[PDB]
Design a protein around this ligand. Structure first.
Ligand SMILES: C[As+](C)(C)CC(=O)[O-]
Length: 265
């Protein structure tokens, strides 16, 4: 039976303002999936549905990305994207309000040097998903990764309670990044605020300056329209991760579903 029959031509998505959802809308146009439906939801509802479907070995298609804990807990695959609708060579960037590195060159320089791998981010995501509190897990991380933190803080000095406001979107990945770097800041002496906001407001907050920095930029593909819209109005000072991926994801037990093209059948 055909992917469209298996899932009733429905794809499970996340928050409507995210670029993955925008990129999935493009792919549906690109591959002529014109009678298909994309359900808007959220990160937590998407994985709850995946879990419910997977536990019953029922077919599902989700808007998925890596780094994500769901790939270590379940056997998943990306559908081949021959048209490259989701693009290529995606990274995760560290952005700030414009001229933030002129005010607090010490904080900027740290953010600039923050980087890490998928497996590493995953250590945090797994525990957070298991119900542990992200500040607590972030503490465990920074102790356990002594050699790494040192790399981040090469040339970085303590402080006297200097305020820094980190905006972030509650994707599982960005929860981890923000909390980890959150900790490394609070140890350096900063008074740290974390402001949760949705995807567009996150960018609007950096570009207007209602927040200082964010670890939540996925570039150049995922957040292309937000970057374009606010070109000139923020600084891009870091790449925390490369090789990251986004697209349509299915459980491996859907053996006959392997490409977005299979959804046309
Ligand atoms: C690939 As994610 C859900 C971490 C970022 C976005 O805007 O879609």
């Amino acid at each position: 039976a055909s992917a469209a029959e298996q899932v009733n031509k429905t794809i499970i998505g996340i928050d409507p303002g995210s670029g993955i959802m925008s990129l999935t809308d493009k792919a549906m146009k690109d591959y002529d999936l014109n009678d298909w439906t994309l359900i808007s939801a959220s990160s937590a509802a998407m994985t709850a549905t995946l879990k419910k479907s997977y536990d019953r070995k029922k077919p599902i298609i989700i808007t998925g990305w890596t780094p994500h804990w769901m790939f270590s807990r379940y056997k998943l695959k990306y559908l081949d994207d021959p048209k490259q609708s989701y693009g290529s060579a995606e990274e995760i960037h560290t952005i700030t309000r414009k001229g933030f590195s002129k005010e607090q060159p010490n904080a900027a320089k740290l953010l600039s040097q923050f980087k890490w791998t998928q497996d590493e981010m995953g250590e945090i995501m797994i525990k957070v998903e298991e119900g542990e509190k992200p500040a607590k897990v972030a503490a465990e991380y920074v102790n356990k990764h002594k050699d790494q933190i040192a790399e981040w803080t090469k040339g970085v000095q303590k402080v006297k309670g200097d305020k820094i406001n980190l905006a972030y979107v509650a994707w599982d990945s960005e929860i981890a990044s923000t909390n980890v770097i959150g900790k490394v800041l609070e140890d350096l002496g900063y008074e740290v605020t974390l402001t949760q906001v949705e995807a567009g407001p996150m960018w609007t907050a950096i570009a207007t300056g209602s927040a200082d920095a964010s670890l939540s930029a996925w570039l150049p593909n995922t957040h292309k329209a937000y970057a374009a819209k606010y070109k000139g109005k923020y600084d891009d000072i870091g790449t925390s991760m490369t090789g990251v991926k986004m697209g349509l994801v299915v459980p491996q037990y859907m053996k006959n579903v392997n490409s977005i093209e299979d959804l046309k059948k």
